[PDB]
Ligand binder design. Sequence first.
Ligand SMILES: N=C(N)NCCC[C@@H](C(=O)O)N1C(=O)CC[C@@H]1C(=O)O
Length: 254
Amino acid sequence: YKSITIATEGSYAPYNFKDAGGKLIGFDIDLGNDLCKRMNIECKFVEQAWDGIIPSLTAGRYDAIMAAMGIQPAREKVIAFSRPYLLTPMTFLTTADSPLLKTQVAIENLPLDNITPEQKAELDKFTKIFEGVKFGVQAGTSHEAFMKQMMPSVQISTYDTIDNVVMDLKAGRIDASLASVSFLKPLTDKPDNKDLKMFGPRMTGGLFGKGVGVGIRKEDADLKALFDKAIDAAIADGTVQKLSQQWFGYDASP
Ligand SMILES: N=C(N)NCCC[C@@H](C(=O)O)N1C(=O)CC[C@@H]1C(=O)O
């Protein structure tokens, strides 16, 4: 390999978004540039809307995806992933004045790979509390998949970007959402968002899979091996931890 093109979305801060000059910035951009230097490959980042990001990769419009993409079983049917470069659970989001905040969380860390009756009881409790509450999620994400598969009785609206979800939650058009802690912690830590709060169980596994990874075509085994070696080195030397603290305000490195 000499040169590759990496697609990102550009609407998911602090992983990938646009600066004041319209340039793509964020953890995925800084990490991608560091990995390419390690691989001795020239890389160019390009913006791609979330809906077509996977088919444009398999159609050969670019060589990899770094766009806060969870390594999840459904996507693994279509593309390959590097080993994870970040780990994060998933949790809920509402407004700081919401009555939803008073709900007792019986299971703080809720793994979904093998749901026990106790874990199902906790998911069912939140489903019942959420029935009547209007949820908003970004379309085409594990957030949408979780609500449709695990909480089908809850009213959901899907959005083109997570930015539009947050806009509608702030405006009171929706009452709650779901996303990773890696997205929600920096969002709620901003003084701009003192009116927003994370809540509920922190979920992992199941349809969410594990980790955030670089999406690569299945046939590109050598490119996956190059990324895996570079990611292992960036984790080992503390680069991923450094970038995670810079962008997220905490260490989400594997
Ligand atoms: N708009 C984007 N560029 N990416 C949205 C990805 C959301 C979600 C997913 O892959 O479907 N995520 C995962 O399930 C774990 C990491 C990520 C998240 O919730 O932050």
